[PDB]
Structure formats: structure tokens, C-alpha cells
């Protein structure tokens, strides 16, 4: 047991993921509102591993503070709209993927 | 409201848990049979765990016993961990948001 370490790592990754997911939605808007800003964001995203949430944001500060603040807000909105539905959706999907994989391989043995 | 973002996040979470499972199993192996740990190491270089179904399928051509072990461990990990995350990530984001905000606003001064 002790699934606690795995939980800490998972929650971190999720935090970074949702950040990514916000940056994504924002870049979708910019591509339509302020295309230069949009491309700036892409070029920034290439210089910085977005999956380092905090490093990514601390770096962003030093270059475009309005955007950083926007992400922090958009991510948290996403966080609230999405989080409760996750344990159901994943566990259900895992069971299903587990199903198909077992059938697939347990049948592959007869081939 | 953000169903398409829920979909993509769950899919990631699925693969992430698959990843985390391969990581426990990889630790056990490294003790039990070094030979397989090395193998599993480079298997993961040739196949991206992030696309997990494709990963598991490719593994079937090589180590079906393990594919099966992964499926069991990943579901266990799921059980232990999933229900805790929405309190965790939320309260984490909030904290983080706070610290970034403070830190940004204090730079505007200093």
C-alpha cells in the first residue's frame, strides 16, 4: 500500500496539466484576438517545459505579467469545472481499457 | 461545461496512472530480475507511455505476463488515489495561485 507518494506525484502532474490546459484555451483565444501574442506564447512554450508549472509561470512573470495572471485564473476555473468528474471517468475508463486489453491478449494466446 | 477538457484530462490521468504502475513494477523488477528491468527500461524509450494503450499493445508482442501485471497494478493505484485528487489539486492550485500572485505583485514594487 502507501498510495500517498503516488497521490502527491499525481496531484502535482495534474496541477501542471490543468495549467497546460489553460495555456491551451488562452492560446486558442489569442490566435483569434491577438495573433502575435498567440505566436509569442508558442515561442515561449518552446523555450519552457510547460509541465514544470511553477518554473514556467515564474519565467513568464519576467516577460508577460498580464498573461500569467490570466492563466492562474483560467486554470483555477478549469480546475473547478473538471475535478469532481475525474475519479469516476478515469476509474471507469481504466476498467474498460483493462477489459479490452485482457480479452485482446488472452485471446491472442490462442492465435 | 468543459467536457472536452475533462475527456482529455481523464485520458492523461489514465496514462499517467499506467506510467506510475510501470514505475512500481520497474522498481520490483530491478530487485527481482535485473534482466527485465533493463528491458522494460528501453522498451519505454521505444514506446511513449503517454499513449498508453498503444504502449500496452506493443508490450503484448514482448511480455504478455507484464502487460497483465501492469493492468492490475494500474487499477489498484487508481483505487487508492483517484478520490483524493480533486481536494488535493484544487487546494494546491489555490495555494500556488496565491504564491504566484503575491510574488508577481511584489516584483512590481521591488
Amino acid at each position: 500500500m502507501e498510495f500517498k507518494k503516488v497521490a502527491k506525484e499525481t496531484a502535482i502532474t495534474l496541477q501542471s496539466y490543468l495549467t497546460y490546459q489553460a495555456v491551451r484555451l488562452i492560446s486558442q483565444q489569442l490566435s483569434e484576438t491577438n495573433p502575435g501574442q498567440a505566436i509569442w506564447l508558442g515561442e515561449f512554450s518552446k523555450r519552457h517545459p510547460i509541465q514544470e508549472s511553477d518554473l514556467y509561470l515564474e519565467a513568464m512573470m519576467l516577460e508577460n505579467k498580464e498573461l500569467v495572471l490570466r492563466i492562474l485564473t483560467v486554470r483555477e476555473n478549469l480546475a473547478e469545472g473538471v475535478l469532481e468528474f475525474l475519479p469516476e471517468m478515469v476509474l471507469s475508463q481504466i476498467k474498460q481499457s483493462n477489459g479490452n486489453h485482457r480479452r485482446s491478449l488472452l485471446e491472442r494466446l490462442t492465435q | 461545461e468543459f467536457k472536452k477538457v475533462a475527456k482529455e484530462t481523464a485520458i492523461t490521468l489514465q496514462s499517467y496512472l499506467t506510467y506510475q504502475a510501470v514505475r512500481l513494477i520497474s522498481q520490483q523488477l530491478s530487485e527481482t530480475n535485473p534482466g527485465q528491468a533493463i528491458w522494460l527500461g528501453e522498451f519505454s524509450k521505444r514506446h511513449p507511455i503517454q499513449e498508453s494503450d498503444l504502449y500496452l499493445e506493443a508490450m503484448m508482442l514482448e511480455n504478455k505476463e507484464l502487460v497483465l501485471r501492469i493492468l492490475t497494478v494500474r487499477e489498484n493505484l487508481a483505487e487508492g488515489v483517484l478520490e483524493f485528487l480533486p481536494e488535493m489539486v484544487l487546494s494546491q492550485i489555490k495555494q500556488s495561485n496565491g504564491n504566484h500572485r503575491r510574488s508577481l505583485l511584489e516584483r512590481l514594487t521591488q
Binding site: 502532474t13 501542471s16 496539466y17 497546460y20 495555456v23 491551451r24 492560446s27 506564447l41 508558442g42 512554450s45 517545459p49 510547460i50 509541465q51 | 492523461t12 499517467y16 506510467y19 507511455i49 503517454q50
Partner: peptide, 7 residues
């Protein structure tokens, strides 16, 4: 595309 990857 901005990509997300788990290190």
C-alpha cells in the same frame, strides 16, 4: 500545438 509530457 503545445505538448504536455510526463518526465
Amino acid at each position: 500545438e503545445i505538448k504536455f509530457e510526463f518526465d
